[PDB]
């Protein structure tokens, strides 16, 4: 399990995380992938967390896309990615509450 990722997703760590989730309510919304279809999330806190995560992602995307080699295609691709992120964020701002 060299290079840290393996360590992170080693069974023991996972178990610990699960335990934390069970007792006290420590989740790491960084750690899990954000769900595709909203309205399968009855809790508000979770939703908020997800929204926050997406915002963070968007910010990250923004930070990188103004790099100096602007003509490279990665940046262009991200522009679409950025849009997608924005859309997701908007969706997360649903009007149930």
């Amino acid at each position: 399990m060299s290079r840290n990722v393996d360590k992170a997703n080693s069974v023991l760590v996972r178990f610990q995380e699960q335990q934390a989730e069970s007792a006290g309510g420590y989740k790491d919304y960084s750690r899990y992938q954000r769900p595709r279809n909203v309205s399968k999330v009855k809790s508000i806190k979770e939703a908020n967390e997800w929204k926050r995560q997406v915002s963070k992602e968007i910010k990250q995307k923004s930070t990188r896309i103004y790099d100096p080699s602007l003509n490279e295609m990665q940046i262009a691709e991200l522009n679409d990615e950025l849009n997608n992120l924005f859309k997701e964020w908007k969706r997360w701002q649903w009007h149930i509450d």
């Binding site: 610990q16 934390a20 006290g24 420590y26 967390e49």
Partner: protein, 252 residues
């Protein structure tokens, strides 16, 4: 009239004063009392208690002995010692302020060292360099559980909470900034107010979201970075001048 109003206080009994931390992290660090191996959680949670001062305020073991400094816990609204507390339980009156006005430079009305530099977030116990009586209120969205209220209503609510807590100089709610500036007469009073209203809900019993006030995040009450718009500045200058004049008079 806190003296003849009552003696007793007993705000939150020592059966249930507080649980110690709130789980961020995986493991609990014994030396810092803070959860480690992770940081996911906005952390600020609403006070389970509050200072309903007219009911609570009273004579203490401190009052008799001649204590200067007021009870932080009382302010917060959770002083389980109550009548046997050594720190004072009332809203800082003028006489009291006058009495501890010598010390009020170096340390707060709670008897705890004011710092030389402000905290970067203006978040707690103000500096001894800059005297202040002026509190930033914030997180009013969060403190009211994202309620669609009128700004005016919010302002009124703020006034209600803060007037009770100390002699007000002046208050401003702002729609654009989404905040509530308050200014007091005495720094001590302001400090007390801050202590009280840190992590407090602005909601009332009559509101429909009273039972879920705990689930939100409280008021973010902090110190006021001076207002830049010019009239205010001018006023401040005038005040300073007046103070200087007074000092001069005292001297001669």
């Amino acid at each position: 009239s806190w003296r003849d109003k009552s003696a007793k206080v007993q705000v939150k009994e020592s059966e249930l004063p507080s649980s110690i931390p709130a789980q961020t992290g995986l493991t609990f660090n014994i030396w810092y009392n803070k959860w480690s191996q992770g940081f996911a959680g906005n952390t600020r949670f609403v006070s389970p208690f509050a200072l309903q001062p007219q009911l609570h305020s009273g004579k203490t073991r401190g009052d008799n002995d001649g204590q200067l400094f007021f009870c932080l816990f009382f302010a917060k609204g959770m002083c389980c010692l109550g009548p046997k507390c050594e720190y004072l339980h009332h809203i800082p009156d003028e006489e009291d302020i006058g009495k501890l006005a010598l010390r009020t430079e170096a340390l707060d009305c709670f008897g705890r060292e004011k710092f030389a530099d402000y905290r970067e977030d203006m978040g707690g116990i103000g500096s001894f360099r800059k005297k202040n009586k002026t509190l930033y209120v914030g997180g009013i969205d969060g403190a009211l559980n994202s309620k669609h209220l009128k700004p005016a209503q919010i302002e009124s609510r703020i006034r209600f909470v803060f007037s009770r807590l100390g002699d007000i100089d002046r208050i401003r709610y702002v729609e654009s900034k989404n905040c509530g500036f308050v200014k007091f007469k005495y720094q001590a009073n302001a400090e007390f107010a801050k202590e009280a209203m840190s992590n407090q809900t602005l909601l009332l019993p009559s509101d429909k979201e009273w039972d879920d006030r705990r689930e939100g995040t409280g008021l973010l009450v902090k110190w006021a970075n001076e207002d830049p718009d010019p009239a205010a500045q001018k006023r401040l200058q005038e005040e300073l001048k007046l103070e200087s004049l007074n000092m001069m008079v005292h001297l001669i």
